[PDB]
Amino acid sequence: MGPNPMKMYPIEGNKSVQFIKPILEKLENVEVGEYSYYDSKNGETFDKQILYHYPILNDKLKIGKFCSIGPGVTIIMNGANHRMDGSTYPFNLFGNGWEKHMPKLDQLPIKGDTIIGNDVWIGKDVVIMPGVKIGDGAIVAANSVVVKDIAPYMLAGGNPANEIKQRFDQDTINQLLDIKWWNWPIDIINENIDKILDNSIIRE
Amino acid sequence: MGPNPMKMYPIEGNKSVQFIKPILEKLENVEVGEYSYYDSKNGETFDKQILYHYPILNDKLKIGKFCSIGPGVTIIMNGANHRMDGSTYPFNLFGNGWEKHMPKLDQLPIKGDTIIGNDVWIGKDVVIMPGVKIGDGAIVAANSVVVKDIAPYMLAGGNPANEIKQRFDQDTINQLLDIKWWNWPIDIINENIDKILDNSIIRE
Amino acid sequence: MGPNPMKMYPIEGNKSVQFIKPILEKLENVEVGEYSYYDSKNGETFDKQILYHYPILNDKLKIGKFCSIGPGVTIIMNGANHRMDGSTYPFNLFGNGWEKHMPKLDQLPIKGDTIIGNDVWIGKDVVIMPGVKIGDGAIVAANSVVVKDIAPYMLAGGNPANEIKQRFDQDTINQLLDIKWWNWPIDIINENIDKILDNSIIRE
Ligand SMILES: CCN(CC)CCS(=O)(=O)[C@@H]1CCN2C(=O)c3coc(n3)CC(=O)C[C@H](O)/C=C(C)/C=C/CNC(=O)/C=C/[C@@H](C)[C@@H](C(C)C)OC(=O)[C@@H]12
Ligand SMILES: CCN(CC)CCS(=O)(=O)[C@@H]1CCN2C(=O)c3coc(n3)CC(=O)C[C@H](O)/C=C(C)/C=C/CNC(=O)/C=C/[C@@H](C)[C@@H](C(C)C)OC(=O)[C@@H]12
Ligand SMILES: CCN(CC)CCS(=O)(=O)[C@@H]1CCN2C(=O)c3coc(n3)CC(=O)C[C@H](O)/C=C(C)/C=C/CNC(=O)/C=C/[C@@H](C)[C@@H](C(C)C)OC(=O)[C@@H]12
């Protein structure tokens, strides 16, 4: 029961909702989970939303399963960073002899990898800056600009984005993070979808 | 004297300025005042700026008179809200038996109506969140994201948007509020335009 | 040695990077320095990023040398300001008799000129409001909305943008602002590029 987790366009008669995994299976350094989807703004594919991602920098992007990515969302990788121990002018890129001035292995600090958890809801036109992490069950308000990490099951928003409120109580979050319903077999999930929607899955 | 309040494009030689009322008089659940206008960004008509507005949700949009709306301003209605008491995943939307997991209207958050007062100036590319109320004579700095109510005759800006300062003294605001020059017959307004532009109408 | 400071498209095989000076050479009230460049978002030329710049107001735009402007950056001049001593409604624009209500020379306060210094890096999609001043060697985070001035060699971001950190210590900044490597003859610069990149040029 349900949509095929490996179909680029799960809903025929709607070429806007797309499954991310089947589309990003070809990309290097990008691990994406099943059922996570993207809501296109003008027909573009999610791969066009990943920016400044260069294999030579070795940074990686990780997206969990069952995520909701609104239209216009953008993920910024480490390619945007300029040198900062002196001038920020990229002499090297202009060539004609300036290519001598290319940064050495240790003069381009890296902020780290980008990992988005499971069951995460990202609003419209949100911008993700390099190296940030987002915990499971988090909700990011539309038009946010995230520079710092966001704890699991939190409500964040703004520019810069800040934590606004806890979705549930600690004990509930603790249990939810321990059962990880998203890793269950598809058949088991189907028999509990309701309990997952009302948060009663922590009881049974 | 003055432009025709019911012409789509009141200014000959300017296919950018539009009177909103004539444009949006066809829409369901949208109530707009006269003389309020929109400055087109690329030729689009203000209707394309109202997002996630569905008749089934019963939320209404109200805009006052004599308002100035900058280019790119968008208004987000309640249609963007996901279910929040559990997982934010929209199972129902994928079909294949999942349609049975469709939420009732009682299980969807309702933030209320969106109400814009009279004589309001909204800056370029401002985003308005659902259920927001903006008082008369208020000013919203460009590029703002409004998530909470804004008092009358207040200058707000930012993301999230916050109140910056009172345009005038309290007694002045109180006087303006119970005068409502915008409700005067057009011929009376014409003979007081200069007095309205300098705040001396409080001296009559 | 290096690229031609007078070539619209300095890099062969990349019609995105463009030199500002040659492109804005036609504009009145716009002065831009050598080597400062723009990274095009969709093939658009930088002149399309300067908004509300009206000769009648006489406000000027000044950009220094050796700057790095990210894609989508827009500069808002004084043509956006509305009258604020009373109603913000621009009666005058609609004509048909209301043209007689046109602000006097002193009924439209002006926030001043917009001056960006030398060696400054402005992030992607950053918006610059009217009258702001940005000192040399300052870094502006992407997606920022700058409403107030930024001091030399400071890091600022947010909406509204705030100064986050001082890149170096006072003595260093003081020394840098005193030598102004950006004003040296191109030949002398070429023999110190590496020294400029690691801030060792202060000890010569
Ligand atoms: C032979 C390699 N090719 C194929 C022809 C190009 C791929 S690349 O890895 O050399 C890439 C090109 C320039 N850099 C850009 O990000 C880039 C290139 O053009 C542009 N950016 C246009 C801009 O994006 C201007 C921007 O201001 C430049 C930025 C933000 C530079 C940030 C600092 N860049 C680096 O530290 C450069 C590292 C070098 C070593 C190269 C690799 C060869 C290692 O990687 C790039 O980022 C490189
Ligand atoms: C038979 C009814 N039709 C005609 C065929 C569709 C109209 S609808 O009212 O069922 C509409 C379709 C899906 N929902 C969307 O907003 C929508 C549909 O496709 C898309 N959105 C593409 C997206 O917008 C993906 C997006 O991420 C989905 C969102 C933001 C869902 C938010 C939560 N949605 C609701 O709570 C769904 C409520 C149901 C009950 C339906 C009505 C039948 C009541 O309304 C919709 O919002 C429904
Ligand atoms: C005869 C003069 N012409 C040729 C026909 C027009 C040039 S203009 O200098 O009168 C110009 C027209 C309206 N203003 C606009 O910014 C403008 C005109 O249409 C539009 N903007 C569409 C919009 O840009 C809507 C926008 O919301 C209007 C803005 C942001 C108004 C801000 C406040 N405007 C001023 O204070 C008006 C000053 C007057 C005096 C006029 C000059 C005659 C002095 O300048 C403009 O800014 C004027």
PDB file of all heavy atoms in Angstrom, chain B residues 26-50, unseen atoms left out:
ATOM      1  N   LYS B  26     -13.409  39.514  -8.032  1.00  0.00           N
ATOM      2  CA  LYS B  26     -13.916  38.233  -8.514  1.00  0.00           C
ATOM      3  C   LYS B  26     -13.624  37.109  -7.530  1.00  0.00           C
ATOM      4  O   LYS B  26     -14.292  36.073  -7.545  1.00  0.00           O
ATOM      5  CB  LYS B  26     -13.311  37.895  -9.879  1.00  0.00           C
ATOM      6  N   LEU B  27     -12.631  37.324  -6.671  1.00  0.00           N
ATOM      7  CA  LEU B  27     -12.204  36.308  -5.714  1.00  0.00           C
ATOM      8  C   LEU B  27     -13.176  36.067  -4.567  1.00  0.00           C
ATOM      9  O   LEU B  27     -13.848  36.981  -4.091  1.00  0.00           O
ATOM     10  CB  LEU B  27     -10.827  36.651  -5.146  1.00  0.00           C
ATOM     11  CG  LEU B  27      -9.661  36.583  -6.129  1.00  0.00           C
ATOM     12  CD1 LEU B  27      -8.336  36.679  -5.383  1.00  0.00           C
ATOM     13  CD2 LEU B  27      -9.730  35.300  -6.945  1.00  0.00           C
ATOM     14  N   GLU B  28     -13.230  34.814  -4.130  1.00  0.00           N
ATOM     15  CA  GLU B  28     -14.063  34.408  -3.011  1.00  0.00           C
ATOM     16  C   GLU B  28     -13.279  34.625  -1.719  1.00  0.00           C
ATOM     17  O   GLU B  28     -12.093  34.296  -1.642  1.00  0.00           O
ATOM     18  CB  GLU B  28     -14.437  32.933  -3.165  1.00  0.00           C
ATOM     19  CG  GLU B  28     -15.470  32.419  -2.179  1.00  0.00           C
ATOM     20  CD  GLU B  28     -16.072  31.095  -2.615  1.00  0.00           C
ATOM     21  OE1 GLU B  28     -15.644  30.561  -3.660  1.00  0.00           O
ATOM     22  OE2 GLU B  28     -16.975  30.586  -1.919  1.00  0.00           O
ATOM     23  N   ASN B  29     -13.940  35.195  -0.714  1.00  0.00           N
ATOM     24  CA  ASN B  29     -13.320  35.436   0.589  1.00  0.00           C
ATOM     25  C   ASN B  29     -12.214  36.493   0.593  1.00  0.00           C
ATOM     26  O   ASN B  29     -11.298  36.439   1.411  1.00  0.00           O
ATOM     27  CB  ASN B  29     -12.808  34.127   1.199  1.00  0.00           C
ATOM     28  CG  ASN B  29     -13.934  33.197   1.602  1.00  0.00           C
ATOM     29  OD1 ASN B  29     -14.919  33.622   2.203  1.00  0.00           O
ATOM     30  ND2 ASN B  29     -13.794  31.918   1.268  1.00  0.00           N
ATOM     31  N   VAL B  30     -12.304  37.449  -0.325  1.00  0.00           N
ATOM     32  CA  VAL B  30     -11.343  38.544  -0.389  1.00  0.00           C
ATOM     33  C   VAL B  30     -12.090  39.869  -0.456  1.00  0.00           C
ATOM     34  O   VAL B  30     -12.812  40.140  -1.418  1.00  0.00           O
ATOM     35  CB  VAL B  30     -10.393  38.416  -1.594  1.00  0.00           C
ATOM     36  CG1 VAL B  30      -9.517  39.652  -1.712  1.00  0.00           C
ATOM     37  CG2 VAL B  30      -9.538  37.167  -1.467  1.00  0.00           C
ATOM     38  N   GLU B  31     -11.907  40.689   0.574  1.00  0.00           N
ATOM     39  CA  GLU B  31     -12.589  41.973   0.690  1.00  0.00           C
ATOM     40  C   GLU B  31     -11.566  43.103   0.625  1.00  0.00           C
ATOM     41  O   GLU B  31     -10.744  43.253   1.528  1.00  0.00           O
ATOM     42  CB  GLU B  31     -13.337  42.017   2.022  1.00  0.00           C
ATOM     43  CG  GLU B  31     -14.664  42.750   1.995  1.00  0.00           C
ATOM     44  CD  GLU B  31     -15.427  42.595   3.298  1.00  0.00           C
ATOM     45  OE1 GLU B  31     -15.985  41.501   3.533  1.00  0.00           O
ATOM     46  OE2 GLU B  31     -15.464  43.563   4.089  1.00  0.00           O
ATOM     47  N   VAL B  32     -11.614  43.899  -0.439  1.00  0.00           N
ATOM     48  CA  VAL B  32     -10.627  44.963  -0.631  1.00  0.00           C
ATOM     49  C   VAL B  32     -11.230  46.366  -0.737  1.00  0.00           C
ATOM     50  O   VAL B  32     -12.285  46.558  -1.339  1.00  0.00           O
ATOM     51  CB  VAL B  32      -9.755  44.689  -1.872  1.00  0.00           C
ATOM     52  CG1 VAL B  32      -8.891  45.889  -2.196  1.00  0.00           C
ATOM     53  CG2 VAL B  32      -8.895  43.459  -1.649  1.00  0.00           C
ATOM     54  N   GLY B  33     -10.538  47.341  -0.154  1.00  0.00           N
ATOM     55  CA  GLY B  33     -10.978  48.724  -0.167  1.00  0.00           C
ATOM     56  C   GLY B  33     -10.587  49.470  -1.429  1.00  0.00           C
ATOM     57  O   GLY B  33      -9.856  48.953  -2.271  1.00  0.00           O
ATOM     58  N   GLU B  34     -11.074  50.699  -1.556  1.00  0.00           N
ATOM     59  CA  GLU B  34     -10.806  51.510  -2.739  1.00  0.00           C
ATOM     60  C   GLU B  34      -9.502  52.290  -2.635  1.00  0.00           C
ATOM     61  O   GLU B  34      -8.990  52.521  -1.542  1.00  0.00           O
ATOM     62  CB  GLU B  34     -11.973  52.463  -3.005  1.00  0.00           C
ATOM     63  CG  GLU B  34     -13.288  51.751  -3.259  1.00  0.00           C
ATOM     64  CD  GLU B  34     -14.441  52.706  -3.490  1.00  0.00           C
ATOM     65  OE1 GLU B  34     -14.372  53.855  -3.008  1.00  0.00           O
ATOM     66  OE2 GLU B  34     -15.421  52.303  -4.154  1.00  0.00           O
ATOM     67  N   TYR B  35      -8.972  52.680  -3.792  1.00  0.00           N
ATOM     68  CA  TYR B  35      -7.741  53.464  -3.883  1.00  0.00           C
ATOM     69  C   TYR B  35      -6.468  52.720  -3.473  1.00  0.00           C
ATOM     70  O   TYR B  35      -5.363  53.198  -3.725  1.00  0.00           O
ATOM     71  CB  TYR B  35      -7.883  54.790  -3.131  1.00  0.00           C
ATOM     72  CG  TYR B  35      -8.888  55.713  -3.776  1.00  0.00           C
ATOM     73  CD1 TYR B  35     -10.145  55.904  -3.218  1.00  0.00           C
ATOM     74  CD2 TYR B  35      -8.589  56.374  -4.959  1.00  0.00           C
ATOM     75  CE1 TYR B  35     -11.072  56.741  -3.815  1.00  0.00           C
ATOM     76  CE2 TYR B  35      -9.506  57.211  -5.563  1.00  0.00           C
ATOM     77  CZ  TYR B  35     -10.745  57.392  -4.987  1.00  0.00           C
ATOM     78  OH  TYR B  35     -11.660  58.226  -5.589  1.00  0.00           O
ATOM     79  N   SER B  36      -6.619  51.557  -2.847  1.00  0.00           N
ATOM     80  CA  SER B  36      -5.461  50.744  -2.492  1.00  0.00           C
ATOM     81  C   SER B  36      -4.852  50.235  -3.795  1.00  0.00           C
ATOM     82  O   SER B  36      -5.579  49.848  -4.710  1.00  0.00           O
ATOM     83  CB  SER B  36      -5.868  49.575  -1.595  1.00  0.00           C
ATOM     84  OG  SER B  36      -6.433  50.036  -0.377  1.00  0.00           O
ATOM     85  N   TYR B  37      -3.527  50.238  -3.889  1.00  0.00           N
ATOM     86  CA  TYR B  37      -2.886  49.846  -5.142  1.00  0.00           C
ATOM     87  C   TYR B  37      -1.716  48.880  -4.990  1.00  0.00           C
ATOM     88  O   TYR B  37      -1.204  48.666  -3.891  1.00  0.00           O
ATOM     89  CB  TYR B  37      -2.435  51.086  -5.919  1.00  0.00           C
ATOM     90  CG  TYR B  37      -1.135  51.689  -5.429  1.00  0.00           C
ATOM     91  CD1 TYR B  37       0.081  51.295  -5.972  1.00  0.00           C
ATOM     92  CD2 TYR B  37      -1.124  52.658  -4.437  1.00  0.00           C
ATOM     93  CE1 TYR B  37       1.268  51.840  -5.534  1.00  0.00           C
ATOM     94  CE2 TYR B  37       0.062  53.213  -3.994  1.00  0.00           C
ATOM     95  CZ  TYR B  37       1.255  52.799  -4.548  1.00  0.00           C
ATOM     96  OH  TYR B  37       2.443  53.342  -4.118  1.00  0.00           O
ATOM     97  N   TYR B  38      -1.296  48.316  -6.121  1.00  0.00           N
ATOM     98  CA  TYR B  38      -0.178  47.381  -6.173  1.00  0.00           C
ATOM     99  C   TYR B  38       0.816  47.794  -7.256  1.00  0.00           C
ATOM    100  O   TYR B  38       0.427  48.141  -8.371  1.00  0.00           O
ATOM    101  CB  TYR B  38      -0.684  45.964  -6.448  1.00  0.00           C
ATOM    102  CG  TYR B  38       0.413  44.931  -6.600  1.00  0.00           C
ATOM    103  CD1 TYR B  38       1.308  44.683  -5.568  1.00  0.00           C
ATOM    104  CD2 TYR B  38       0.548  44.202  -7.774  1.00  0.00           C
ATOM    105  CE1 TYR B  38       2.308  43.736  -5.702  1.00  0.00           C
ATOM    106  CE2 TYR B  38       1.545  43.254  -7.918  1.00  0.00           C
ATOM    107  CZ  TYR B  38       2.422  43.026  -6.881  1.00  0.00           C
ATOM    108  OH  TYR B  38       3.417  42.085  -7.019  1.00  0.00           O
ATOM    109  N   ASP B  39       2.099  47.756  -6.918  1.00  0.00           N
ATOM    110  CA  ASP B  39       3.157  48.104  -7.857  1.00  0.00           C
ATOM    111  C   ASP B  39       3.752  46.814  -8.406  1.00  0.00           C
ATOM    112  O   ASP B  39       4.580  46.186  -7.758  1.00  0.00           O
ATOM    113  CB  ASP B  39       4.230  48.930  -7.146  1.00  0.00           C
ATOM    114  CG  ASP B  39       5.077  49.749  -8.104  1.00  0.00           C
ATOM    115  OD1 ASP B  39       4.585  50.097  -9.203  1.00  0.00           O
ATOM    116  OD2 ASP B  39       6.247  50.100  -7.836  1.00  0.00           O
ATOM    117  N   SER B  40       3.322  46.418  -9.599  1.00  0.00           N
ATOM    118  CA  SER B  40       3.762  45.157 -10.196  1.00  0.00           C
ATOM    119  C   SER B  40       5.277  45.006 -10.312  1.00  0.00           C
ATOM    120  O   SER B  40       5.989  45.953 -10.644  1.00  0.00           O
ATOM    121  CB  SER B  40       3.110  44.949 -11.565  1.00  0.00           C
ATOM    122  OG  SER B  40       3.307  43.620 -12.017  1.00  0.00           O
ATOM    123  N   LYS B  41       5.756  43.794 -10.049  1.00  0.00           N
ATOM    124  CA  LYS B  41       7.179  43.491 -10.114  1.00  0.00           C
ATOM    125  C   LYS B  41       7.639  43.206 -11.539  1.00  0.00           C
ATOM    126  O   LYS B  41       8.696  43.671 -11.962  1.00  0.00           O
ATOM    127  CB  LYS B  41       7.501  42.292  -9.223  1.00  0.00           C
ATOM    128  CG  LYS B  41       8.985  41.980  -9.100  1.00  0.00           C
ATOM    129  CD  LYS B  41       9.219  40.906  -8.047  1.00  0.00           C
ATOM    130  CE  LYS B  41      10.594  41.031  -7.420  1.00  0.00           C
ATOM    131  NZ  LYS B  41      10.629  40.371  -6.088  1.00  0.00           N
ATOM    132  N   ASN B  42       6.842  42.435 -12.274  1.00  0.00           N
ATOM    133  CA  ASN B  42       7.185  42.061 -13.643  1.00  0.00           C
ATOM    134  C   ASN B  42       5.991  42.049 -14.594  1.00  0.00           C
ATOM    135  O   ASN B  42       6.094  41.560 -15.719  1.00  0.00           O
ATOM    136  CB  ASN B  42       7.860  40.687 -13.664  1.00  0.00           C
ATOM    137  CG  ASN B  42       9.275  40.722 -13.125  1.00  0.00           C
ATOM    138  OD1 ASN B  42      10.095  41.537 -13.553  1.00  0.00           O
ATOM    139  ND2 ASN B  42       9.572  39.832 -12.186  1.00  0.00           N
ATOM    140  N   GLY B  43       4.859  42.578 -14.141  1.00  0.00           N
ATOM    141  CA  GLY B  43       3.664  42.615 -14.965  1.00  0.00           C
ATOM    142  C   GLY B  43       2.525  41.781 -14.406  1.00  0.00           C
ATOM    143  O   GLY B  43       1.391  41.879 -14.872  1.00  0.00           O
ATOM    144  N   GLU B  44       2.825  40.964 -13.402  1.00  0.00           N
ATOM    145  CA  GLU B  44       1.817  40.107 -12.783  1.00  0.00           C
ATOM    146  C   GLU B  44       0.763  40.915 -12.028  1.00  0.00           C
ATOM    147  O   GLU B  44       1.042  42.006 -11.533  1.00  0.00           O
ATOM    148  CB  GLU B  44       2.477  39.091 -11.843  1.00  0.00           C
ATOM    149  CG  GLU B  44       2.889  39.647 -10.486  1.00  0.00           C
ATOM    150  CD  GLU B  44       4.062  40.604 -10.569  1.00  0.00           C
ATOM    151  OE1 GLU B  44       4.831  40.524 -11.551  1.00  0.00           O
ATOM    152  OE2 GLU B  44       4.217  41.437  -9.650  1.00  0.00           O
ATOM    153  N   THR B  45      -0.451  40.376 -11.952  1.00  0.00           N
ATOM    154  CA  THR B  45      -1.538  41.034 -11.234  1.00  0.00           C
ATOM    155  C   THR B  45      -1.631  40.495  -9.806  1.00  0.00           C
ATOM    156  O   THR B  45      -1.464  39.298  -9.573  1.00  0.00           O
ATOM    157  CB  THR B  45      -2.872  40.845 -11.972  1.00  0.00           C
ATOM    158  OG1 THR B  45      -3.122  39.447 -12.158  1.00  0.00           O
ATOM    159  CG2 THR B  45      -2.771  41.376 -13.392  1.00  0.00           C
ATOM    160  N   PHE B  46      -1.917  41.387  -8.863  1.00  0.00           N
ATOM    161  CA  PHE B  46      -1.934  41.060  -7.435  1.00  0.00           C
ATOM    162  C   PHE B  46      -2.552  39.717  -7.028  1.00  0.00           C
ATOM    163  O   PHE B  46      -2.205  39.172  -5.981  1.00  0.00           O
ATOM    164  CB  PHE B  46      -2.567  42.194  -6.623  1.00  0.00           C
ATOM    165  CG  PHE B  46      -2.270  42.116  -5.152  1.00  0.00           C
ATOM    166  CD1 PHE B  46      -0.961  42.063  -4.701  1.00  0.00           C
ATOM    167  CD2 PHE B  46      -3.295  42.078  -4.222  1.00  0.00           C
ATOM    168  CE1 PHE B  46      -0.680  41.983  -3.350  1.00  0.00           C
ATOM    169  CE2 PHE B  46      -3.019  41.999  -2.868  1.00  0.00           C
ATOM    170  CZ  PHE B  46      -1.711  41.951  -2.434  1.00  0.00           C
ATOM    171  N   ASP B  47      -3.461  39.183  -7.836  1.00  0.00           N
ATOM    172  CA  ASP B  47      -4.088  37.908  -7.498  1.00  0.00           C
ATOM    173  C   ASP B  47      -3.063  36.778  -7.417  1.00  0.00           C
ATOM    174  O   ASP B  47      -3.218  35.844  -6.631  1.00  0.00           O
ATOM    175  CB  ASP B  47      -5.205  37.556  -8.486  1.00  0.00           C
ATOM    176  CG  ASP B  47      -4.743  37.598  -9.924  1.00  0.00           C
ATOM    177  OD1 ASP B  47      -4.478  38.708 -10.427  1.00  0.00           O
ATOM    178  OD2 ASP B  47      -4.619  36.577 -10.631  1.00  0.00           O
ATOM    179  N   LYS B  48      -2.011  36.877  -8.224  1.00  0.00           N
ATOM    180  CA  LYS B  48      -0.961  35.864  -8.236  1.00  0.00           C
ATOM    181  C   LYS B  48      -0.134  35.917  -6.957  1.00  0.00           C
ATOM    182  O   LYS B  48       0.685  35.036  -6.702  1.00  0.00           O
ATOM    183  CB  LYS B  48      -0.047  36.046  -9.451  1.00  0.00           C
ATOM    184  CG  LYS B  48      -0.775  36.136 -10.783  1.00  0.00           C
ATOM    185  CD  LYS B  48      -1.600  34.890 -11.061  1.00  0.00           C
ATOM    186  CE  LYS B  48      -2.012  34.818 -12.526  1.00  0.00           C
ATOM    187  NZ  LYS B  48      -2.616  36.093 -13.007  1.00  0.00           N
ATOM    188  N   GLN B  49      -0.360  36.953  -6.154  1.00  0.00           N
ATOM    189  CA  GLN B  49       0.383  37.141  -4.911  1.00  0.00           C
ATOM    190  C   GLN B  49      -0.296  36.509  -3.692  1.00  0.00           C
ATOM    191  O   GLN B  49       0.323  36.380  -2.635  1.00  0.00           O
ATOM    192  CB  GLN B  49       0.640  38.629  -4.662  1.00  0.00           C
ATOM    193  CG  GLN B  49       1.401  39.324  -5.776  1.00  0.00           C
ATOM    194  CD  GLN B  49       2.787  38.745  -5.986  1.00  0.00           C
ATOM    195  OE1 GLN B  49       3.086  38.207  -7.053  1.00  0.00           O
ATOM    196  NE2 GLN B  49       3.635  38.855  -4.971  1.00  0.00           N
ATOM    197  N   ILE B  50      -1.563  36.126  -3.831  1.00  0.00           N
ATOM    198  CA  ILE B  50      -2.281  35.481  -2.731  1.00  0.00           C
ATOM    199  C   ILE B  50      -2.098  33.970  -2.798  1.00  0.00           C
ATOM    200  O   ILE B  50      -2.620  33.313  -3.697  1.00  0.00           O
ATOM    201  CB  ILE B  50      -3.777  35.835  -2.764  1.00  0.00           C
ATOM    202  CG1 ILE B  50      -3.966  37.353  -2.793  1.00  0.00           C
ATOM    203  CG2 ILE B  50      -4.490  35.230  -1.560  1.00  0.00           C
ATOM    204  CD1 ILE B  50      -3.278  38.069  -1.661  1.00  0.00           C
TER     205      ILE B  50
END
